[PDB]
């Protein structure tokens, strides 16, 4: 390529303040490893970082330097293996396929249970399979496909995120991994035990859409206040019940429909 | 126990409160005023002032979340990540805020320099590299610029 | 619990407004009762279950008509119109009944009772804003000299040291 | 009228959030319908006026149970509990019915529709 372009790409400049309170500009060559940083991690760090008591975000950025370095090390190692890199690159595709499959199986279950572009094409294929194979076999193939899709998604997730780099305790602690293993457990359990269990997978919608999660957060940040208010309502109901029972007991008459 | 269960279930769910389920009173009854007061008090306390406090909290949380989000995005898109300077200070100057956050104060360049210091051998350390390495070892974060930019102070050359 | 008390404070700081709004609702109910009693008195028919007839009239006197309207109109979602006898299309007073019911619903159930719940939300917002301002002042300025944290930036001594040794109240 | 358009804009700028909230309500209704159908299927009895019996069962199939729950539970102020048959005190499933009705009211009528 152009000789000046490569050297231009691998050069960076920064500004630092010395112990003498003077500012100095440092031009240095970018390390070869630094080229392997992921864009998703960059965006996550940029948005997630929060101001400290002094109002500067530098502290957290520095504290994350070691984790960032380890992540880039793992990214280079992953880039060494082509197959794993290809699997990791399609994390969004795997997740979208899994969610679409879950929606379709739930829809079919709701419509038929109990029984004896790309999206329209999948709809037509599902309809044809139902017409020929049947509702049962079609649900079976959809469940198996979802199972393999989710297992591949989990593998891609661990490879891309590299949460195992922190340690086994760290990966187990991560809530996302726990949610994903919950998903795989629910999928296998439904495929092998009962079809209705697929309904649980619909909760994945909350994870898929950010706006829905933000809406739910309104009734989650101050959940304690809501529970305490409910307890206050219960206490008032208890006092009202005492007052009624002591004085107005004959008026508490209800209608009941007795089954044969 | 059963009276409590009935009151809660059929009074919280019903719009009119517990009064609806109870038997309809008669005008020529001794307890009619008591029933009226009981029903009205229950409706005005447990259905209009208590259940409404469970929905007001949700609205308040919505407002708090919106305000927090707006403040966070404003800070993100107005100030600089590293030095914390504001966009207004850069107006009417040779260098704009866009250039400041792209080349002069690109935090990713700082991360690259930190990686270089960690990787580079101690024998090949330069002056600034050695100083930054010592500061990193000491854990001090003073070497990060804080509300100071060389471009802005460039106008101080005339004063000097 | 502090949070429960804070929640209750929403309906306590502006309690006077709530009581006055309730009085306004009572006045409107009183006027509606007068209008009904003067003109629509036969339609005020109620069902009663006598303990050991099943129908009675609850607008013979103004006091009872007011009581019935308030009790069975404020509690019911549809207003006073629900309790009254169902009118017939071939009736002279059908338009009057329609206007009466709709006006009562749109005045005393949608615009008055809603003003008793809007006050609570407004008080919640006021309390949140006041609390946020108080905590911000507490955690940003100095108790004694009242200086701000920003003035201490880019200096030898930080705000943390100022409020611990130099200006410890 | 400009003011009317401004008022309408309130339910248009964040329409996506409203639709997603409705979908969440639908999902919760679907789960509640599954729970009812699996366990409380006899209690799903509805009244019908036949044009020229007066009672019918509306939870024989999962699709119909979902339809009945959504239509007559979201519209009713008291939730799904109102439509279901009134339970008896001397019944084994009375606590289950109480918990079911209260949970539905406190989740899908007070916390979801309010969102
Ligand atoms: N200190 C900072 N303050 C504000 N925004 C910043 C700061 N550092 C980086 N950014 C922004 O974060 C993103 C990172 O910039 P970067 O140079 O990586 O962008 P890019 O266009 O993807 O890269 P490339 O240089 O390869 O074209 C850009 O939006 C940049 O404006
Ligand atoms: N003028 C002030 N402005 C702001 N905060 C203050 C001020 N004076 C005291 N404080 C804060 O009030 C608390 C009182 O400080 P104090 O020295 O008593 O803390 P301590 O750690 O419990 O004591 P000790 O010195 O025995 O460790 C601390 O949080 C201090 O930061
Ligand atoms: Zn800067
Ligand atoms: Zn001070």
């Amino acid at each position: 390529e152009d000789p000046l372009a490569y050297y231009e790409n691998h050069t960076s400049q920064i500004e630092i303040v010395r112990q003498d309170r003077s500012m100095e500009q440092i031009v240095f060559p970018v390390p070869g490893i630094c080229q392997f940083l992921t864009e998703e991690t960059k965006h996550r760090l940029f948005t997630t970082t929060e101001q400290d008591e002094q109002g500067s975000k530098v502290s957290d950025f520095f504290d994350q330097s070691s984790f960032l370095h380890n992540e880039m090390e793992w990214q280079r190692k992953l880039r060494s293996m082509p197959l794993i890199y290809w699997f990791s690159r399609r994390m969004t595709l795997w997740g979208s396929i899994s969610f679409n499959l879950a929606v379709f199986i739930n829809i079919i279950i709701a419509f038929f249970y109990p029984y004896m572009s790309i999206r329209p094409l999948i709809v037509a294929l599902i309809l044809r399979s139902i017409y020929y194979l049947g509702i049962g076999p079609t649900l079976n193939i959809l469940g198996a496909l979802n199972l393999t899709n989710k297992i591949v998604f989990v593998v891609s997730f661990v490879g891309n995120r590299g949460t195992f780099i922190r340690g086994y305790k760290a990966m187990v602690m991560d809530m996302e991994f726990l949610y994903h293993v919950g998903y795989i457990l629910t999928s296998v359990l439904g495929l092998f035990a009962h079809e209705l269990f697929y309904s649980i997978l619909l909760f994945d919608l909350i994870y898929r859409e950010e706006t829905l999660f933000n809406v739910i957060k309104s009734v989650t940040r101050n959940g304690r206040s809501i529970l305490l208010t409910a307890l206050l309502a219960l206490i008032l109901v208890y006092l009202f019940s005492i007052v009624g029972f002591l004085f107005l007991k004959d008026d508490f008459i209800l209608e009941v429909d007795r089954l044969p | 126990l059963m009276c409590i269960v009935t009151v809660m279930n059929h009074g919280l769910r019903n719009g009119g409160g517990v009064g609806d389920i109870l038997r309809k009173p008669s005008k020529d009854e001794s307890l009619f005023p008591a029933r009226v007061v009981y029903d009205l008090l229950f409706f005005f306390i447990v259905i209009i002032i208590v259940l409404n406090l469970i929905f007001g909290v949700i609205i308040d949380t919505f407002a708090d979340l919106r305000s927090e989000k707006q403040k966070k995005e404003e800070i993100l898109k107005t100030t600089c990540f590293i030095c914390g300077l504001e966009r207004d200070k850069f107006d009417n100057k040779t260098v704009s805020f866009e250039e400041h956050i792209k080349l002069e104060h690109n935090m990713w360049n700082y991360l690259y320099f930190i990686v270089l210091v960690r990787v580079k051998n101690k024998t090949d350390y330069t002056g600034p590299e050695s100083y930054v390495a010592q500061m990193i070892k000491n854990k001090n974060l003073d070497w990060f610029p804080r509300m100071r930019a060389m471009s802005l102070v460039s106008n101080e050359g005339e004063g000097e | 619990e502090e949070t429960l008390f804070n929640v209750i404070k929403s309906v306590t700081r502006n309690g006077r407004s709530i009581l006055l709004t309730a009085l306004l609702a009572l006045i409107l109910v009183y006027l509606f009762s007068i209008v009904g009693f003067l003109f629509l008195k036969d339609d005020f028919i109620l069902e009663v279950d006598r303990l050991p007839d099943s129908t009675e009239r609850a607008c013979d006197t103004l006091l009872m008509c007011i009581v019935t309207v308030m009790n069975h109109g404020l509690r019911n979602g549809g207003g006073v119109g629900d309790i009254l006898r169902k009118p017939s299309k071939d009736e002279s007073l059908f338009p009057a009944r329609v206007v009466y019911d709709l006006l009562f619903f749109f005045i005393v159930i949608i615009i008055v009772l809603n003003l008793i719940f809007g006050v609570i939300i407004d008080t919640f917002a006021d309390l949140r804003s006041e609390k946020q301002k108080k905590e911000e002042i507490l955690k940003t300025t100095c108790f004694i000299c009242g200086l701000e944290r920003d003035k201490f930036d880019n200096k030898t001594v930080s705000f943390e040291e100022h409020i611990k040794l130099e200006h410890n109240m």
Side-chain angles (χ1 to χ4, degrees), chain A residues 2-115 117-260, chain B residues 1-154 157 159, chain C:
Chain A
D2 215 340
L4 265 174
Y6 166 108
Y7 295 155
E8 182 41 78
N9 289 358
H10 296 51
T11 303
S12 293
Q13 54 199 109
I14 67 180
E15 294 201 40
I16 69 160
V17 68
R18 300 290 300 273
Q19 181 272 333
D20 316 308
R21 284 261 202 291
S22 298
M23 271 166 261
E24 313 196 306
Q25 167 161 187
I26 296 153
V27 180
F28 67 91
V30 166
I33 271 174
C34 261
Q35 194 71 1
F36 285 14
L37 187 65
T38 58
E39 300 267 339
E40 293 87 357
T41 290
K42 289 171 74 183
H43 186 65
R44 172 162 70 71
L45 254 295
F46 180 48
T47 304
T48 296
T49 312
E50 58 180 333
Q51 302 203 303
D52 63 355
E53 80 298 347
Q54 186 59 257
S56 64
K57 312 184 191 177
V58 303
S59 63
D60 302 88
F61 192 66
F62 192 118
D63 293 27
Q64 290 280 299
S65 72
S66 55
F67 157 57
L68 264 280
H69 193 294
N70 292 46
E71 186 269 1
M72 312 148 87
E73 291 295 329
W74 174 234
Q75 201 73 4
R76 183 146 74 71
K77 267 65 184 154
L78 166 57
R79 214 71 81 71
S80 68
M81 279 82 89
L83 179 65
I84 313 310
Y85 187 51
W86 187 72
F87 273 17
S88 84
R89 261 165 81 107
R90 313 297 167 70
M91 181 149 85
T92 183
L93 184 66
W94 296 128
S96 151
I97 293 157
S98 80
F99 177 63
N100 284 47
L101 282 193
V103 166
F104 277 104
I105 317 143
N106 289 297
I107 270 177
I108 295 286
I109 281 197
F111 266 102
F112 282 67
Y113 194 104
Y115 55 117
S117 165
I118 292 92
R119 272 173 193 251
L121 197 142
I122 285 164
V123 165
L125 290 176
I126 291 159
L127 294 157
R128 191 188 181 183
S129 68
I130 294 152
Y131 193 53
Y132 289 0
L133 312 188
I135 288 283
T138 295
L139 287 171
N140 274 36
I141 80 168
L142 290 177
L145 282 170
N146 187 3
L147 186 31
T148 74
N149 214 239
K150 187 53 51 161
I151 221 71
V152 171
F153 181 96
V154 164
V155 166
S156 157
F157 176 79
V158 47
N160 190 3
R161 300 308 193 72
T163 186
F164 71 96
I165 197 71
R166 279 85 161 273
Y168 308 121
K169 191 170 185 66
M171 91 183 151
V172 169
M173 192 75 177
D174 189 4
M175 80 84 77
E176 193 161 1
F177 182 62
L178 298 177
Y179 164 57
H180 281 128
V181 66
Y183 199 117
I184 199 53
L185 162 53
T186 287
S187 186
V188 299
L189 182 163
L191 176 76
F192 281 21
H194 212 168
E195 316 172 26
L196 297 185
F197 269 105
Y198 286 64
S199 64
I200 294 159
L201 303 183
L202 281 173
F203 288 155
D204 174 303
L205 172 63
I206 295 162
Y207 174 87
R208 279 263 296 171
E209 312 285 10
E210 179 182 1
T211 46
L212 181 53
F213 186 63
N214 289 358
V215 166
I216 276 173
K217 273 167 61 173
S218 68
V219 82
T220 298
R221 176 166 287 189
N222 290 354
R224 185 182 180 71
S225 297
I226 291 164
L227 275 284
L228 292 196
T229 309
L231 292 179
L232 173 57
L234 174 54
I235 293 162
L236 294 176
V237 160
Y238 173 49
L239 293 157
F240 271 107
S241 210
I242 275 160
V243 168
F245 163 80
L246 270 202
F247 294 57
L248 320 177
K249 111 188 304 197
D250 293 307
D251 286 9
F252 267 78
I253 287 165
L254 262 60
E255 201 149 1
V256 64
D257 274 358
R258 284 161 191 311
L259 82 174
Chain B
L1 182 62
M2 190 84 158
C3 211
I4 291 157
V5 162
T6 281
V7 168
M8 142 182 83
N9 186 1
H10 303 124
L12 298 188
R13 294 195 310 110
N14 286 329
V18 70
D20 265 9
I21 54 157
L22 312 185
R23 156 180 81 88
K24 314 230 183 56
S26 189
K27 73 187 179 61
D28 65 77
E29 219 151 342
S30 46
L31 273 289
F32 186 94
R35 273 290 303 288
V36 163
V37 170
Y38 184 76
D39 287 358
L40 262 168
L41 206 58
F42 191 101
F43 168 72
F44 265 110
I45 287 174
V46 189
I47 300 283
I48 291 279
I49 288 169
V50 167
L51 289 179
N52 279 4
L53 288 168
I54 297 168
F55 176 45
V57 168
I58 293 166
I59 294 159
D60 189 13
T61 310
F62 267 114
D64 184 11
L65 292 165
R66 181 176 53 89
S67 76
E68 177 204 90
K69 188 187 310 309
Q70 284 186 1
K71 203 163 163 223
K72 283 182 173 175
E73 311 296 321
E74 184 85 329
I75 284 166
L76 210 73
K77 306 312 209 313
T78 285
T79 77
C80 175
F81 194 105
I82 294 296
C83 70
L85 251 191
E86 320 167 20
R87 153 168 302 165
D88 79 2
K89 307 301 184 61
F90 279 80
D91 179 311
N92 233 353
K93 293 300 218 293
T94 300
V95 73
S96 68
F97 184 69
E98 290 81 1
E99 290 284 300
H100 178 74
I101 67 190
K102 188 65 175 197
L103 314 176
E104 288 202 36
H105 275 182
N106 198 353
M107 47 172 209
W108 297 128
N109 292 349
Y110 285 66
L111 165 60
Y112 304 162
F113 190 80
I114 291 165
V115 169
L116 183 84
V117 167
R118 278 196 221 294
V119 167
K120 204 184 200 172
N121 189 3
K122 164 63 61 64
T123 77
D124 305 357
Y125 276 16
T126 62
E129 292 174 3
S130 66
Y131 165 76
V132 168
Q134 299 292 349
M135 278 287 177
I136 287 163
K137 156 189 271 164
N138 223 317
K139 309 303 221 70
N140 184 6
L141 297 150
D142 274 317
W143 65 289
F144 280 100
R146 167 83 203 152
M147 328 275 304
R148 303 174 57 190
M150 278 191 338
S151 306
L152 284 192
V153 182
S154 72
Chain C
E1 312 285 10
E2 179 182 1
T3 46
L4 181 53
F5 186 63
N6 289 358
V7 166
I8 276 173
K9 273 167 61 173
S10 68
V11 82
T12 298
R13 176 166 287 189
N14 290 354
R16 185 182 180 71
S17 297
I18 291 164
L19 275 284
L20 292 196
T21 309
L23 292 179
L24 173 57
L26 174 54
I27 293 162
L28 294 176
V29 160
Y30 173 49
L31 293 157
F32 271 107
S33 210
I34 275 160
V35 168
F37 163 80
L38 270 202
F39 294 57
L40 320 177
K41 111 188 304 197
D42 293 307
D43 286 9
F44 267 78
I45 287 165
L46 262 60
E47 201 149 1
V48 64
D49 274 358
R50 284 161 191 311
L51 82 174
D53 208 48
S54 305
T55 303
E56 72 184 2
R57 315 169 95 272
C59 197
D60 282 349
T61 40
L62 196 67
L63 182 62
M64 190 84 158
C65 211
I66 291 157
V67 162
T68 281
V69 168
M70 142 182 83
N71 186 1
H72 303 124
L74 298 188
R75 294 195 310 110
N76 286 329
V80 70
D82 265 9
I83 54 157
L84 312 185
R85 156 180 81 88
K86 314 230 183 56
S88 189
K89 73 187 179 61
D90 65 77
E91 219 151 342
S92 46
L93 273 289
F94 186 94
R97 273 290 303 288
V98 163
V99 170
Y100 184 76
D101 287 358
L102 262 168
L103 206 58
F104 191 101
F105 168 72
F106 265 110
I107 287 174
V108 189
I109 300 283
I110 291 279
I111 288 169
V112 167
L113 289 179
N114 279 4
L115 288 168
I116 297 168
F117 176 45
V119 168
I120 293 166
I121 294 159
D122 189 13
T123 310
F124 267 114
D126 184 11
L127 292 165
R128 181 176 53 89
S129 76
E130 177 204 90
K131 188 187 310 309
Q132 284 186 1
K133 203 163 163 223
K134 283 182 173 175
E135 311 296 321
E136 184 85 329
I137 284 166
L138 210 73
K139 306 312 209 313
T140 285
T141 77
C142 175
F143 194 105
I144 294 296
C145 70
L147 251 191
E148 320 167 20
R149 153 168 302 165
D150 79 2
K151 307 301 184 61
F152 279 80
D153 179 311
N154 233 353
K155 293 300 218 293
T156 300
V157 73
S158 68
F159 184 69
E160 290 81 1
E161 290 284 300
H162 178 74
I163 67 190
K164 188 65 175 197
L165 314 176
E166 288 202 36
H167 275 182
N168 198 353
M169 47 172 209

